[PDB]
Design a protein around this ligand. Structure first.
Ligand SMILES: [Mg+2]
Ligand SMILES: [Mg+2]
Ligand SMILES: [Mg+2]
Ligand SMILES: [Mg+2]
Ligand SMILES: [Mg+2]
Ligand SMILES: [Mg+2]
Ligand SMILES: [Mg+2]
Ligand SMILES: [Mg+2]
Ligand SMILES: [Mg+2]
Ligand SMILES: [Mg+2]
Ligand SMILES: [Mg+2]
Ligand SMILES: [Mg+2]
Ligand SMILES: [Mg+2]
Ligand SMILES: [Mg+2]
Ligand SMILES: [Mg+2]
Ligand SMILES: [Mg+2]
Ligand SMILES: [Mg+2]
Ligand SMILES: [Mg+2]
Ligand SMILES: [Mg+2]
Ligand SMILES: [Mg+2]
Ligand SMILES: [Mg+2]
Ligand SMILES: [Mg+2]
Ligand SMILES: [Mg+2]
Ligand SMILES: [Mg+2]
Ligand SMILES: [Mg+2]
Ligand SMILES: [Mg+2]
Ligand SMILES: [Mg+2]
Ligand SMILES: [Mg+2]
Ligand SMILES: [Mg+2]
Ligand SMILES: [Mg+2]
Ligand SMILES: [Mg+2]
Ligand SMILES: [Mg+2]
Ligand SMILES: [Mg+2]
Ligand SMILES: [Mg+2]
Ligand SMILES: [Mg+2]
Ligand SMILES: [Mg+2]
Ligand SMILES: [Mg+2]
Ligand SMILES: [Mg+2]
Ligand SMILES: [Mg+2]
Ligand SMILES: [Mg+2]
Ligand SMILES: [Mg+2]
Ligand SMILES: [Mg+2]
Ligand SMILES: [Mg+2]
Ligand SMILES: [Mg+2]
Ligand SMILES: [Mg+2]
Ligand SMILES: [Mg+2]
Ligand SMILES: [Mg+2]
Ligand SMILES: [Mg+2]
Ligand SMILES: [Mg+2]
Ligand SMILES: [Mg+2]
Ligand SMILES: [Mg+2]
Ligand SMILES: [Mg+2]
Lengths: 93, 46, 271
RNA sequence: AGGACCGAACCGACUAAUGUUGAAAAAUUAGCGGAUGACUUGUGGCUGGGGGUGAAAGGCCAAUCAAACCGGGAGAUAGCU
RNA sequence: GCUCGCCGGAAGACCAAGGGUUCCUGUCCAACGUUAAUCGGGGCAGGGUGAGUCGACCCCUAAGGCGAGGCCGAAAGGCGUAGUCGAUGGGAAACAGGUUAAUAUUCCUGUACUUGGUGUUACUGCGAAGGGGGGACGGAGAAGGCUAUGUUGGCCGGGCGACGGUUGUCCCGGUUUAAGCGUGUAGGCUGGUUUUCCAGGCAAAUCCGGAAAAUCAAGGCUGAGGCGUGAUGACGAGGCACUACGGUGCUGAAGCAACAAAUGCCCUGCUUCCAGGAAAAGCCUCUAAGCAUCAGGUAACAUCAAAUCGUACCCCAAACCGACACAGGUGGUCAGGUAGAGAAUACCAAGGCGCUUGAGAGAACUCGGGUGAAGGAACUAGGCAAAAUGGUGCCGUAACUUCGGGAGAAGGCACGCUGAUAUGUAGGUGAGGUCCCUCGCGGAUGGAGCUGAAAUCAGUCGAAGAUACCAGCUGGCUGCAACUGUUUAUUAAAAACACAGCACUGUGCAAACACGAAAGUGGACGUAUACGGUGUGACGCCUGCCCGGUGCCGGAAGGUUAAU
């Protein structure tokens, strides 16, 4: 499971937005870009160890990259995993 | 009026799919040709 | 029983039913059934190999004791049943050690009858036993054709065979066809005629009738075009052919048997 | 009870007009037949080109079929224009 | 923003398939949009899809596909065993409310349920790839009990009328509440427990099956809905405050009854018929190899677990199939009011729209409609097209017939409203009360209230009461086909094909026949009352003569005759 090698590689970025931000006030939830493969399990562990905060539960979803055809030839941004992580009640960083 | 192309992904991947070409001599022979032409798109996929 | 229907509607007016009140109502006996899948007439290449077959009612197959091996153990007929797979009816028969089997219902069989098999069994309707021990002259159905194999001759509604001469180690049967055939005397066989025989008195009466028995229409070659069938096209009702099978072989006459291997066993062809 | 009657859905396609560089490479509008049956329909399967399937019209087999489409023999041959 | 009109079994809403960001916000207008466009499904940038219990994966199998070995085939390869795959079908569990610009049975609030691991504890025979059960099955029709839903009343909040009247028998609105848990109802099926023994269930069985007794009759299984809880709650007009005027916060009445009532549910029922109506796992049980103070098995409690992938948006369409923002095509689900038999139809509700060039003119002619003096098929190939008929009840109805039909033959009469019988009838429904009792969702009694056609008598308005939409024209002679069906997708729907019925002819089963160099397979898990081929085409009365020719069958003494 740890694989702290793995635990370090699982978390990529915070993800900013209106939604992501009310989700932190209103529902003590934090929103991150995590590895594509990452499990809710793996995501839980990581957030605990690295962000030192207790973790109520983890939700995930997969985001489909948008496409942007510029004349004949087309391109595709890639798919990433989003993680809505709730933070118990001991709400800190 | 009802036209001749009524799509269905399962039926697609089944009759013209990659593995369907890998199944048989002449289907594999297709794949070769397309590779000889250097085709960007061997089969149709996800 | 055979019933005529009143003409409340054409294609009904001509209907002649065959309704047998001593027939079990509802489902058969579950454990003696199995799948049976329809075939459209088509073999394992996808090609219709036999014309005119398809649709019509779904059918479960009842396993049926064609060999009749349970020697010694008596059994009673529990009930008579309709079997959608044959023109005959069948008997649900309960053996004295608790085993159950289906058999072809012979002519008179009722619920609460004893039947039995083995070389000894009473010469009575329902009883099976090798032919060496059956009185020459008896009328007999469901006749084995090799010892131990199982029923092959006289299986259809209203049919029978009659042993007309033992001699040798073979018998000589008058088959319902009219043919007279030899067959070894250790071939098992059953006393009786096979059951219901008002069968032939049905009339169907309308088209859907045959349809729901899985019979699709037959197209007369004379209504086809020459590319299809040897019976040409015409130009408003012509014939002028010597009548043939769609594959250019003669109907109306030509003998088509050919065996030699079994030629020995035939004593008189039918007529 | 019924391949029963009338009539929507549903399946069909008898008549007329409109349309005919169409709203449409077969339809619109008014009328029309079947509508518990040989009815109708979704999903998947099977049959392959002198081959399939055909309640038989030479119908249908991807806007086509008296022998599909694709590639090859191939620059077939053309005493014809 | 106010009005007007249109759809409303859809032109509303939700899925599936299919699309693949079209979803939401900002911003821009070249090109795309049949016009302009500041707008857009267009450009650009950003945001957006949150699940143990929705679906998929998964377990299981259908048709069918693949298929170690194998069988067959010049090579390629074809078939096929064990097996292994394959949903369109079987298999555990979640609901109401709230919320976002855009997700929600996934987030939040409330309240649950499933099945595994661990643990503790009490209690116990546990134990398959096997046996048994079960899962597990068609069509039609019948009517009862329900619910979804609706109408009225009551109840609550609000109203007192732009113009004669409106404090009342007046007006308007609302009156909503899930799973889960408890109760076992209307109603469906079946008699139970015990003991003994047995050629069956590939071995075994306490199970199933079979045979015997003994014994008590009430026993069990299934099961809509109701009621209760869930709900101290949610929701609820409206208030009251704030407001960037978009909204936000706070608060919050009544929240019942009667009657009507599906096509939904009881119902995988019941009755009934002939064409006789999948499989396998899950699940219950039985034991075998086994393991026997173990492991297990059942239960309570606690506890952990339930991964991964899908979820935006279009959906009978501007996002799919049609080259188009195309009058076409596309499976499933939901069903409000009045009139109505109705899912027709007309008008409305909820909701969605006015179809992406418009402005004027009021010519011919064309397309689509309305009315038409007198005549009434004189038109025309032909009544093509129009016009006409059109409902319900009662009366009434020819030839002919296979006695069913013909038949809605034809042809009449009635039809609105108001009063009376009866201030609302017959019918339906059914509360209080009285009594009974195995007292329950019970039985008998009782008729309040509610709802409610139809008929006659009398009166009355109009030219007209089936007043609109809607909705057969009728009759006579004759050809052909018995009939329902099928067919030329796109100029032929017919007398053509089919058909039930009839006949001939092949076929003894390793059937004939058919697909196959072959293996293998259909015919068929059939067996001559069966299967194939050919012609005929219900049925009534019938179906004569000809075997020279040509086909076929039988035959044979001769003659002629191949390889050798
Ligand atoms: Mg997910
Ligand atoms: Mg025929
Ligand atoms: Mg026939
Ligand atoms: Mg023809
Ligand atoms: Mg030929
Ligand atoms: Mg002629
Ligand atoms: Mg009918
Ligand atoms: Mg009709
Ligand atoms: Mg036509
Ligand atoms: Mg039409
Ligand atoms: Mg298909
Ligand atoms: Mg075509
Ligand atoms: Mg050719
Ligand atoms: Mg070519
Ligand atoms: Mg050449
Ligand atoms: Mg050339
Ligand atoms: Mg406006
Ligand atoms: Mg785009
Ligand atoms: Mg423009
Ligand atoms: Mg938009
Ligand atoms: Mg855009
Ligand atoms: Mg959660
Ligand atoms: Mg092999
Ligand atoms: Mg194979
Ligand atoms: Mg599987
Ligand atoms: Mg499925
Ligand atoms: Mg939405
Ligand atoms: Mg435990
Ligand atoms: Mg089993
Ligand atoms: Mg109700
Ligand atoms: Mg006034
Ligand atoms: Mg959605
Ligand atoms: Mg729509
Ligand atoms: Mg448009
Ligand atoms: Mg369109
Ligand atoms: Mg309508
Ligand atoms: Mg406009
Ligand atoms: Mg007129
Ligand atoms: Mg006139
Ligand atoms: Mg006049
Ligand atoms: Mg006149
Ligand atoms: Mg004239
Ligand atoms: Mg004239
Ligand atoms: Mg006309
Ligand atoms: Mg008219
Ligand atoms: Mg004439
Ligand atoms: Mg006809
Ligand atoms: Mg017809
Ligand atoms: Mg045509
Ligand atoms: Mg026959
Ligand atoms: Mg004929
Ligand atoms: Mg004759």
């Amino acid at each position: 499971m740890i694989r702290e090698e793995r635990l370090l590689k699982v978390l990529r970025a915070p993800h900013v937005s209106e939604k992501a931000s009310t989700a932190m006030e209103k529902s003590n939830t934090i929103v991150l870009k995590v590895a594509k493969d990452a499990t809710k399990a793996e995501i839980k562990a990581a957030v605990q160890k690295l962000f030192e905060v207790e973790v109520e539960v983890v939700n995930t979803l997969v985001v489909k990259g948008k496409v942007k055809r510029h004349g004949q030839r087309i391109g595709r941004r890639s798919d990433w995993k989003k993680a809505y992580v709730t933070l118990k009640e001991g709400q800190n960083l | 009026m009802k036209r001749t192309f009524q799509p269905s992904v399962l039926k697609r991947n089944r009759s013209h799919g990659f593995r369907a070409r890998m199944a048989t001599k002449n289907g594999r022979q297709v794949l070769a040709r397309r590779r000889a032409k250097g085709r960007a798109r061997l089969t149709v996929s996800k | 029983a055979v019933v005529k229907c009143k003409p409340t509607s054409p294609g009904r007016r001509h209907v002649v039913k065959v309704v047998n009140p001593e027939l079990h109502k509802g489902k058969p006996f579950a454990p003696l059934l199995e799948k049976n899948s329809k075939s459209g007439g088509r073999n394992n290449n996808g090609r219709i190999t036999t014309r005119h077959i398809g649709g019509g009612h779904k059918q479960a197959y009842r396993i049926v004791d064609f060999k009749r091996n349970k020697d010694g153990i008596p059994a009673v007929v529990e009930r008579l049943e309709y079997d959608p797979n044959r023109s005959a009816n069948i008997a649900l028969v309960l053996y004295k050690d608790g085993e159950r089997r289906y058999i072809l219902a012979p002519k008179g069989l009722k619920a609460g009858d004893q039947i039995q098999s083995g070389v000894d069994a009473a010469i009575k309707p329902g009883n099976t036993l090798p032919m060496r021990n059956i009185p020459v002259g008896s009328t007999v159905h469901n006749v084995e054709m090799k010892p131990g194999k199982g029923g092959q001759l006289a299986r259809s509604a209203g049919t029978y065979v009659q042993i007309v001469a033992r001699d040798g180690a073979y018998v000589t049967l008058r088959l319902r066809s009219g043919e007279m055939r030899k067959v070894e005397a250790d071939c098992r066989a059953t006393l009786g005629e096979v059951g219901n025989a008002e069968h032939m008195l049905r009339v169907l009466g309308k088209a859907g009738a045959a349809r729901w028995r899985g019979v699709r229409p037959t197209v007369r070659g004379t209504a086809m075009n020459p590319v299809d069938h040897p019976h040409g096209g015409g130009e408003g009702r012509n014939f002028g052919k010597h009548p043939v099978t769609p594959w250019g072989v003669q109907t109306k006459g030509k003998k088509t048997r050919s065996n030699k291997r079994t030629d020995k066993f035939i004593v008189r062809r039918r007529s």
